[PDB]
Design a protein around this ligand. Structure first.
Ligand SMILES: [Cl-]
Ligand SMILES: [Cl-]
Ligand SMILES: [Cl-]
Ligand SMILES: [Cl-]
Ligand SMILES: [Cl-]
Ligand SMILES: [Cl-]
Ligand SMILES: [Cl-]
Ligand SMILES: [Cl-]
Ligand SMILES: [Cl-]
Ligand SMILES: [Cl-]
Ligand SMILES: [Cl-]
Ligand SMILES: [Cl-]
Lengths: 230, 230, 230, 230, 230, 230
């Protein structure tokens, strides 16, 4: 059975990161090291300071001192922020809002950096998240169409609903694009990982895991045993 | 028996939050996680720094890493503050003073954001709280009348007296508006939760809990057993 | 026997407060919570940062999360400082030096805010404390006369001598004014609390307690048993 | 036998103070409280931040919450610094260098504030300490002559040599002035306290103690038993 | 058998450094001391703050208080940064990107400072790492050719791939240059150290070790036993 | 046998100092106190913040509260820095680079302050350390000649090589100058202290100790037993 990659979360907030052992804080390195110690191949690192930051050295420490691969997201919205992030040596970045608000910029980024770029999409069902005073979340399939035309290598789809994984949506995206899709959200137990691993032959590549870890539904080693060991 | 939702409090003060285990401080995530671990569906998060702040990343961490829903209040007084708060992805916000001092702004907010907006009212009996040099707390029923005309989805009524829950007031508001009302204050024991849960069929939706928790009157699991488990 | 109210001290210094368990520091909330846990009805909170500060959020946390009533003092010397303090929702404030240096301002404050205002007087015997290069402590009875004409609701008299409670002075003030008087200083043992409680029928309302607590002369529960439980 | 007062040292450095239990740091209040707990009547508090500072709130906390009397020194060199220090309510201050470099200012201070002012003199044998590029330590007896003419109430003489107490010098000063003299330095054992206590009838009032405490030569209770209990 | 030198890593990030005992943070001195305590001759110190800083005093502390030799890298990109680093007294520095982007500057540095200068090259296989919007990693052998013409004393080759040591590349560089080469990356077990030590007679001088230490593959004493004890 | 004075090191770095008990950080006072507790007469205090700072209060605390004598070095390079350091009351200072780069200034300092001034010389064998872009370490004997003409009271010679004590150099300097010389570096065991103590009759006065302490070669009490107890 083909392996479902896991990307346990590391959130950088006020220049530190929670680590799940109970909880403690410390550096992003210590949080990512905890996951590596458990058998992780990847971490999904979100720089929340940058998103809403000067954590470049903290991020570079993770890249330089750990074997785990870093997928970095948060505030990668313009030429300077993107170039600086890639200069840190991370394995991959995720673009988010601006990549959908600035489609030509996203295309320019994909053209230049190729498989180092993935695009994140936050969804409630099949609706894109986000509502401001004058802006609304666009049409998911119209957005996907633009990214596909740009040759986006990889999609990260985060279900943000609070009210299991959306298999139908993940299926539709893998079929429209023929690209790897990474799922996030909708995971409450190891059974949800089983459900996602059944989709690996269809193109679901991996899952970001975080909420279920902090909720104590399972540990990372338990998740890796279910998702698959390479 | 219909369930009374509980919204245990998390107060962000100097960029940290007390957690009740004895007390310790740490991040808002750790405080909200403690409640989630106890079975909470919601937390009522007050950004006191913003009210009297740059806690956006701390708040986003809670939203992103926890299953608990966040009702966010504190300093949501103008277009920028409101839009920024909603951009954090929180389930709901509460407006307070400005929403009563700027009725047209409140109406504009309700029109645009709908059920993401609730309005908080601080009361002593049936008098609105607040006295300045030249401003006084307005007429509770005149204020409610304006909010009802605006189509406010939900009210959060906090009894600030220090001298049980005001059943008569909560009854009157649910009947005037036909909207859900969340109670805060006047809770000293589990019996007060019983009293409030009897009002769920009349439209009392939930209770914010905080004072009684810190006073040791009960624990959150004990409260949830009384208020109801879904 | 009529109860003598106790107002155990909480001093906010560099944005933190000592807590007496040995001593430890933490937030003003944790200090006030310790007293509440012991049975306190009130705390006497002094913002020393403001007096000699941006502790508004820390103070609001105490008001919002605790059942104990807060009597707040420190740097309440002008329209802005006073209005901001009252906006925090505290039960009562104490004015100090400026209230005696600006009698018309004090009168204006008393007229507007009524029983939310008490005035603190520091004394050595019957002499008002304070000596600068060009200013001296005024005449205690001349100052009291002005406050009485203004209708001051309540006096807090702090004996600052270091060289038991001054029963004669407290008696004279209760008789001149017919107002409640709160005593501070001159307490070295539980017997001093007995002495003060005998004055409750004459108008001594309460005692601030602090020095004797830190000196280990008694604990707060021991003091409350002597002063009276409501 | 007349009692020799002890004034154990508290040094405020970077807004904190070492406490001798081993050593730990914390607030000036906690350091002064440790001495009070041991039976101290006085502490000799040096604000080193001010000397070489905004510790006003920390100092006021000590004054307000402790029974121990504070003798405050450090950076009290001009009208503003002196007035601010006295406004903190401390029992006594010590003037140092400026009081000898600005004799008329010192006289003005003594005239206004009387027994709240003592003057500190640092000595090596009978030579005043201090050598700059263009300034030298003046003549001890010529300096004393000016202070005596000014009516200085009290002298604090600190022996700064590192190469027992100088009984002859302390004798000469008490006889020239008829004023109380407080000794500091030259104390290596309890016997040195005995030597100093024999001088109490001649006018040596007290000793600052610090070096011997940190050196472990004795504890404060042991010192108080030797110096005398009132 | 000729000894392979080990250069265990110390990364200075936010003015502190992780130490591997589990992990803890503290000063760069404490991290380097841990390695020295284990038998290290060298540490490879990276100032990540400078790279992406004012850690000069922290670095000087290591140089001054420890017997271990420091190889310092990070942000040594111009005349001022280089001169300041060498003024700290470190045994050796490593130049990185600028040394390849500014070949004449690198030559000037090598000419002046000789064997105090080594040049670091980050590689994926035989491709130089780094891709920006308009800049790409140059040709490894063309870069090496320029450094050889400049008389570069020593090369530090870091394999940054995440997808054993590259013996062929290390062989080619030692043969092209006749200079010592230090390897970094590609070490997952003690066997990889054996592989590298076999290359010591060919000119591989040492290995930086870090990833494998934090991964728990071996301890530093275990590594030193394999690499060789002098 | 004449005693060899020991001057255990205290390095002030980021306003704190490592203390060797394992290691911990705290204040310079706590570090110097540890040495005093072990029997030290002197500490050699280096203000690395000043060298590469506002540690004046921290330094004054050491001087004022401890019996140990302080030899202070670091950044004493000009009239203001030197005068300020001496105003802290330290027993002695060491001048370093500027004293050799500004010989007339050094002479002016020696003329004014006499035996309070010692000059530090960093050496590799008999070569003065330091190489910049345009400056080189001068000729050791030519530098010494200038200092001797100036009447320098004392020399501190630090061997900075990393590749026992240099008896020949220390001998030559004591004979050229007839002044006390303090050695630093080249100490790996108690035997090296024996070697240095044999030179006391020739004019070697003392040794700074630090590297060997942190390396665990001996403890300070063990060193004092070897160097001599007065
Ligand atoms: Cl990576
Ligand atoms: Cl998850
Ligand atoms: Cl939420
Ligand atoms: Cl409650
Ligand atoms: Cl209150
Ligand atoms: Cl008291
Ligand atoms: Cl006092
Ligand atoms: Cl002493
Ligand atoms: Cl080095
Ligand atoms: Cl490694
Ligand atoms: Cl000294
Ligand atoms: Cl040494």
């Amino acid at each position: 059975q083909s392996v479902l990659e896991l990307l346990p979360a590391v959130d950088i907030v006020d220049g530190q990161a929670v680590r799940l052992l109970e909880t403690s804080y410390g550096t992003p390195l210590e949080a990512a090291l905890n996951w590596q110690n458990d058998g992780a191949e990847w971490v999904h690192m979100v720089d929340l300071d940058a998103a809403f930051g000067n954590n470049a050295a903290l991020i570079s420490d993770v890249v330089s001192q750990l074997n785990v691969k870093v997928e970095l997201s948060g505030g990668l919205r313009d030429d300077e922020s993107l170039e600086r992030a890639l200069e840190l040596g991370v394995a991959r970045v995720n673009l988010g809002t601006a990549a959908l608000e600035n489609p030509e910029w996203t295309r320019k980024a994909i053209d230049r950096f190729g498989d180092k770029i993935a695009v994140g999409l936050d969804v409630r069902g099949t609706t894109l998240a986000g509502r401001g005073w004058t802006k609304e979340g666009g049409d998911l399939w119209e957005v996907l169409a633009r990214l596909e035309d740009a040759g986006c290598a990889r999609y990260v789809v985060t279900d943000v609903t609070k009210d299991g994984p959306n298999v139908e949506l993940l299926r539709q995206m893998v079929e429209k694009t023929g690209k790897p899709v990474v799922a996030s959200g909708g995971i409450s137990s190891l059974e949800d990982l089983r459900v996602l691993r059944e989709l690996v032959p269809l193109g679901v590549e991996g899952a970001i895991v975080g909420k279920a870890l902090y909720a104590g539904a399972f540990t990372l080693p338990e998740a890796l045993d279910v998702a698959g060991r390479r």
